[PDB]
Design a protein that fits this description.
Length: about 260
């Protein structure tokens, strides 16, 4: 029995995506089609702000995408020398805040000082920043699309100066239609499709409908968690399985029972 995972991205745990590998333990042939992609934005502007630390009180990074954008805007605008020559240490004398273990690793990688997050998430960082005095110069926050960011309003509500710059945006993976086309043409309608977020559902459901035609009723739809399940229900799809926890093991258990 073939199963399809529509997940944000293919992960790599010692050579394989752990969700696909786990299903494989049980004779379940799983395929992953990614539903999220990203694009970088405003890197020249970001390079200019980076080259003027005297105008800022510090930096906030909450995503590896933003640190990647930093690396990228330095290379592209000829500021690599200067970063290593007169920027890195200038910015390191200021305050550098990080959320995310992956973010923190990259922050270490470009020189800034580091010692990881010490914030588990945006809301806890916001509390930490607001419990202390702040600089009269704004904190620079290279970020994602403003609609998903909560830091800008959390800090401003407590009087903290900040300047946000969107340097990456999350988008529907532009291969979804083609990848689903190829899968169904080669493999046929899958026994099960698992969604990993409401977004993924939004970006892929119409194509799944068109490809599945009237066989959609035979597909066992699975959700990695209740929020995703609720999004499934909202589109009126029956939820055959909701993983008890969002892990490869709990998904495989679910899919296996649903397919018995």
């Amino acid at each position: 029995m073939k199963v399809l995972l529509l997940k944000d991205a293919k992960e790599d745990d010692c050579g394989q995506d752990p969700y696909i590998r786990e299903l494989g333990l049980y004779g379940l042939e799983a395929t992953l089609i990614p539903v999220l992609s990203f694009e970088f934005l405003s890197l020249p502007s970001f390079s200019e702000k980076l080259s003027h630390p005297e105008d800022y009180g510090g930096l906030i990074f909450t995503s590896p995408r933003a640190v990647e954008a930093a690396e990228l805007c330095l290379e592209q605008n000829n500021k690599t020398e200067v970063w290593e020559r007169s920027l890195k240490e200038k910015w390191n004398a200021k305050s550098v805040y990080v959320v995310g273990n992956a973010t923190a690793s990259l922050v270490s990688k470009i020189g800034l000082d580091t010692e990881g997050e010490t914030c588990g998430n945006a809301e806890k960082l916001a509390e930490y920043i607001c419990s202390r005095e702040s600089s009269a110069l704004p904190l620079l926050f290279p970020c994602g699309n403003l609609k998903r960011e909560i830091l800008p309003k959390a800090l401003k509500d407590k009087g903290i100066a900040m300047e946000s710059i969107t340097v990456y945006q999350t988008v529907a993976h532009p291969g979804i239609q083609g990848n689903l086309n190829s899968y169904y043409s080669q493999q046929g309608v899958p026994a099960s499709i698992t969604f990993f977020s409401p977004s993924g559902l939004t970006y892929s459901l119409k194509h799944i409908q068109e490809l599945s035609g009237d066989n959609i009723d035979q597909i066992k739809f699975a959700a990695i968690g209740p929020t995703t399940a609720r999004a499934l229900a909202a589109q009126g799809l029956p939820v055959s399985c909701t993983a008890e926890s969002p892990t490869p093991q709990a998904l495989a258990t679910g899919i296996r029972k649903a397919l018995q």
